[PDB]
Amino acid sequence: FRKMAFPSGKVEGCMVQVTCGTTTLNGLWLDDVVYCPRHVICTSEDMLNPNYEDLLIRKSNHNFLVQAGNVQLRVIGHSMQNCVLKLKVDTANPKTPKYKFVRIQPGQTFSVLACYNGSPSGVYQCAMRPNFTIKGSFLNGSCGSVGFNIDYDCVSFCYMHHMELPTGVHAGTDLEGNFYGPFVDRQTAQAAGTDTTITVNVLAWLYAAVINGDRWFLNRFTTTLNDFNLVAMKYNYEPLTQDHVDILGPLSAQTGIAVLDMCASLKELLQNGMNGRTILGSALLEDEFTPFDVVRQCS
Amino acid sequence: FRKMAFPSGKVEGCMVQVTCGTTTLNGLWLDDVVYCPRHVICTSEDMLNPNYEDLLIRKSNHNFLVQAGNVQLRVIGHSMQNCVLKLKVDTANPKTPKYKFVRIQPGQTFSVLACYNGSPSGVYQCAMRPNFTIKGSFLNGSCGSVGFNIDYDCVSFCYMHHMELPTGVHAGTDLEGNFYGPFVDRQTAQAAGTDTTITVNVLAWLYAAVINGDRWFLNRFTTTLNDFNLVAMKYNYEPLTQDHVDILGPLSAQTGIAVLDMCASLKELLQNGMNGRTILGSALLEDEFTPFDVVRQC
Numbered sequence: 001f002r003k004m005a006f007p008s009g010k011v012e013g014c015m016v017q018v019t020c021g022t023t024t025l026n027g028l029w030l031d032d033v034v035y036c037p038r039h040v041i042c043t044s045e046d047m048l049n050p051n052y053e054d055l056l057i058r059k060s061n062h063n064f065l066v067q068a069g070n071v072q073l074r075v076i077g078h079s080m081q082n083c084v085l086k087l088k089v090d091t092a093n094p095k096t097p098k099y100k101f102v103r104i105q106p107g108q109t110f111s112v113l114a115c116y117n118g119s120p121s122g123v124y125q126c127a128m129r130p131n132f133t134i135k136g137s138f139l140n141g142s143c144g145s146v147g148f149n150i151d152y153d154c155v156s157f158c159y160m161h162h163m164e165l166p167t168g169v170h171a172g173t174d175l176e177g178n179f180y181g182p183f184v185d186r187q188t189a190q191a192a193g194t195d196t197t198i199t200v201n202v203l204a205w206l207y208a209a210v211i212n213g214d215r216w217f218l219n220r221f222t223t224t225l226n227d228f229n230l231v232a233m234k235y236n237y238e239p240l241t242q243d244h245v246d247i248l249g250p251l252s253a254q255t256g257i258a259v260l261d262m263c264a265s266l267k268e269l270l271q272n273g274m275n276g277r278t279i280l281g282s283a284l285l286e287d288e289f290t291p292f293d294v295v296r297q298c299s
Numbered sequence: 300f301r302k303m304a305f306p307s308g309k310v311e312g313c314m315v316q317v318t319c320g321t322t323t324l325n326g327l328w329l330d331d332v333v334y335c336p337r338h339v340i341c342t343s344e345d346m347l348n349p350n351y352e353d354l355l356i357r358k359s360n361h362n363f364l365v366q367a368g369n370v371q372l373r374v375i376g377h378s379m380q381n382c383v384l385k386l387k388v389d390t391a392n393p394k395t396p397k398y399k400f401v402r403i404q405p406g407q408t409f410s411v412l413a414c415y416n417g418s419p420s421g422v423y424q425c426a427m428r429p430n431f432t433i434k435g436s437f438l439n440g441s442c443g444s445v446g447f448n449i450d451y452d453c454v455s456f457c458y459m460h461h462m463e464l465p466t467g468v469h470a471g472t473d474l475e476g477n478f479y480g481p482f483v484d485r486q487t488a489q490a491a492g493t494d495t496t497i498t499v500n501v502l503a504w505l506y507a508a509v510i511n512g513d514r515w516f517l518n519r520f521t522t523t524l525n526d527f528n529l530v531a532m533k534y535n536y537e538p539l540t541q542d543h544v545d546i547l548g549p550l551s552a553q554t555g556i557a558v559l560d561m562c563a564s565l566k567e568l569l570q571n572g573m574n575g576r577t578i579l580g581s582a583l584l585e586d587e588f589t590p591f592d593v594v595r596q597c
């Protein structure tokens with residue numbers, strides 16, 4: 001199993017840069033709107049505890065430089081939606097894909113197109129941690145880079161990059177400007193919750209092992225979902241939700257192993273350990289592959 | 300830190316579907332030529348000992364169906380260079396990027412755009428292994444997927460996908476159709492040479508772990524280059540050359556850890572293991588980041 005990103009070309013065709021004064025970050029150009037982090041309007045002094053509404057009132061359309069490459073896109077309207085700035089521009093992006101804006105759940109994976117000055121540098125897959133942070137590669141100027149999934153020819157945009165936390169992890173918003181997690185777009189020190197292991201993805205990984213014929217860890221018993229969640233919490237595993245049970249349906253059907261039976265198998269691994277053994281060639285359980293990722297690389 | 304692929308857009312605009320008989324795979328459409336694996340011209344029974352020159356002379360242009368999305372492209376010529384079929388079409392690809400065809404060295408990395416039925420499906424980073432296999436993710440229908448690097452706006456194509464080995468690693472050619480390694484485009488079980496670990500990349504990765512604040516594995520021990528290489532070869536690691544030491548200079552400077560000091564740390568890891576611990580999240584030493592791959596990101 002490799003971490004595999006979606007092909008990035010449909011998102012590359014939407015990347016622009018947005019500049020206020022000397023501050024430049026990336027924007028997303030879809031139809032005749034450019035979306036970017038609202039802190040592009042912030043000076044240094046403004047970043048400690050900005051009054052975004054007051055800062056934006058002082059802004060006019062002609063204070064915003066939007067460029068696709070070296071080509072300027074004229075701004076004809078501006079508004080703020082939560083922590084995202086929306087810039088209406090006078091040109092509809094001819095490369096606009098079919099798209100949606102989705103807010104993902106913790107544990108879900110997505111591709112990030114890391115971008116600097118409106119130019120993509122690289123693409124990689126990220127899992128959103130249970131504490132709503134991501135472990136990316138984001139250097140200065142990366143804000144406004146987006147995360148996405150692609151289903152058929154439809155791009156589901158789910159993340160826009162805004163900030164780094166003291167531990168080195170990253171935080172940002174959905175494309176409606178609402179942060180994932182208890183974070184704010186102020187340059188104050190902020191703490192992520194204690195992270196936990198993504199239980200549903202570990203379960204997907206166990207299903208993947210079974211699909212490949214590696215099934216020593218399967219036991220003859222089942223469990224309740226509440227029993228598992230109480231036990232799992234003691235090992236720093238995320239409690240399972242009903243949505244988690246539902247997204248494991250395809251893999252449960254593929255293997256004939258009921259979700260709660262795999263939960264019992266995992267409970268035993270947590271309490272007893274691997275006792276010298278490996279799963280899929282590894283002594284560690286993997287938690288960054290979703291049920292959907294498993295089906296993509298096996299089938 | 301993060302394995303990262305090049306943005307794939309420039310390559311996506313070149314992928315098409317190529318069909319001959321009941322075999323469909325991917326092609327690379329640059330200017331007015333579509334490049335693809337020649338084994339598309341084989342039936343099930345041909346694949347066991349295929350005489351490609353014979354099979355090719357018996358094909359006509361109309362036997363090849365090339366589709367760029369919803370559009371069939373007309374094949375007006377066909378030839379073969381080593382293991383790659385070249386289909387001349389009547390229309391030029393307006394999305395052709397600036398490009399070169401390069402043959403990459405073992406230990407170097409590249410991005411793979413995995414495709415099925417001419418449609419891009421995923422992008423990921425691979426290294427050319429010392430034994431000239433690659434550890435990819437390729438399913439039925441992936442043949443003709445390509446590997447590439449991007450330097451400025453120029454795409455250097457270095458890999459085209461042909462086969463899977465019984466160990467689950469993968470083999471293919473450069474865009475001139477020459478296999479990497481001792482492999483042949485026939486349906487026979489083929490083993491690769493003994494693999495070895497790309498030492499300069501493991502060292503680059505340790506420097507990445509140090510930069511990210513992981514340093515439990517460092518030590519005050521030191522080593523000569525030859526004594527390191529003696530131990531490396533014992534553990535089926537590649538010898539480290541003076542050119543590799545040179546290439547690690549930027550990372551050495553940045554961290555203040557001499558290359559030969561990092562070699563002494565790696566020697567201790569080979570001889571002792573990691574004792575339960577992990578490095579950058581891994582229970583295993585990773586060897587598919589090059590020095591350049593680490594710098595670009597750190």
Ligand SMILES: *[C@@H](O)[C@H](C[C@@H]1CCNC1=O)NC(=O)[C@H](CC(C)C)NC(=O)OC[C@@H]1CCC(=O)N1Cc1cccc(Cl)c1
Pocket residue numbers: 025039042047138139140141142143144162163164165166167168170184185186187188189190191
């Ligand atoms: C895009 O403009 C950048 C992206 C940064 C640059 C380096 N890596 C990134 O993720 N975003 C910022 O500069 C933000 C923008 C403001 C409006 C939030 N600023 C930022 O990250 O401030 C410092 C962060 C904010 C939350 C927090 O806890 N911070 C303190 C911090 C974080 C990490 C390390 C250190 Cl030493 C301090």
Ligand SMILES: *[C@@H](O)[C@H](C[C@@H]1CCNC1=O)NC(=O)[C@H](CC(C)C)NC(=O)OC[C@@H]1CCC(=O)N1Cc1cccc(Cl)c1
Pocket residue numbers: 324338341346437438439440441442443461462463464465466467469483484485486487488489490
């Ligand atoms: C593209 O046409 C593919 C897709 C393959 C199959 C799924 N994953 C892939 O990478 N390649 C092929 O079908 C080749 C075509 C011939 C003309 C080389 N064949 C192939 O890869 O299958 C047989 C391989 C070839 C070398 C070898 O060792 N093979 C025997 C083998 C390997 C692994 C498992 C099994 Cl059951 C047999």
